[PDB]
Design a protein around this ligand. Structure first.
Ligand SMILES: Cc1ncc(CO)c(N)n1
Length: 215
């Protein structure tokens, strides 16, 4: 399909944009949580920005109707964000990470602004859904196999891998993909073009975000 054609056409930054969100390591014989804590912090401030973004996509699916179930595909996504956002607060506390004292970095402050460029009524629904999809898919792709490759490393940190690696999120990202795919399948030269620039564009930010915490 239209999307796989694009990912397989762009497997490139996609792969770059789809490498493990945080690694874990060993130094002076102590588990090193350097990337993990960097990722937790930066990913929490974005998630706070991602929330109203999706809000604006929910409002659009309700008025840029194609199917009745679209809003529920989106409504659930946003729904887990309540628990996901709650999960970030528990982690902040058990890992001694102070969110009020996190400094949003360039590749993050920037994502704050881009999501904003999607909140405007001027952007076409198919473009917006493509972004909302890609953003899911990348974290799903970044977190697949994790559990399994989790027992192939010294000390595994598993709390995240469970949140974005479970079978419920895989099929959620999927109900979301089913929509995107149905929309792009009608977009006229103007809008489609606008979309692919966006798929490849979500990957660019995921890559420059992923570098903040590299290990
Ligand atoms: C950068 C980034 N992309 C996607 C997600 C979650 O889907 C996240 N938490 N952060």
């Amino acid at each position: 399909g239209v999307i796989d054609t694009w990912i397989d056409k762009h497997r490139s930054i996609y792969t770059a944009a789809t490498r493990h969100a945080f690694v874990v390591s060993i130094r002076d014989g102590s588990v090193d949580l350097s990337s993990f804590r960097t990722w937790l912090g930066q990913d929490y401030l974005f998630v706070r920005r991602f929330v109203p973004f999706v809000a604006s996509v929910l409002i659009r699916a309700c008025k840029d109707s194609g199917e009745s179930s679209d809003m529920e595909v989106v409504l659930g996504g946003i729904a887990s964000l309540n628990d996901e956002i709650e999960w970030f607060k528990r982690e902040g506390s058990k890992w001694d990470v102070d969110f009020s004292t996190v400094v949003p970095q360039r590749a993050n402050q920037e994502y704050g602004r881009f999501l904003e460029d999607l909140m405007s009524s001027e952007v076409k629904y198919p473009v917006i859904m493509t972004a909302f999809w890609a953003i899911e898919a990348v974290y799903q792709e970044s977190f697949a196999h994790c559990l399994e490759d989790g027992n192939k490393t010294p000390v595994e940190l598993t709390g995240a891998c469970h949140r974005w690696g479970n079978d419920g999120f895989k099929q959620y990202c999927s109900s979301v993909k089913n929509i995107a795919e149905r929309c792009l399948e009608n977009a006229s030269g103007e809008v489609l073009g606008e979309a692919e620039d966006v798929l490849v564009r979500v990957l660019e930010l995921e890559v420059a975000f992923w570098e903040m915490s590299r290990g």
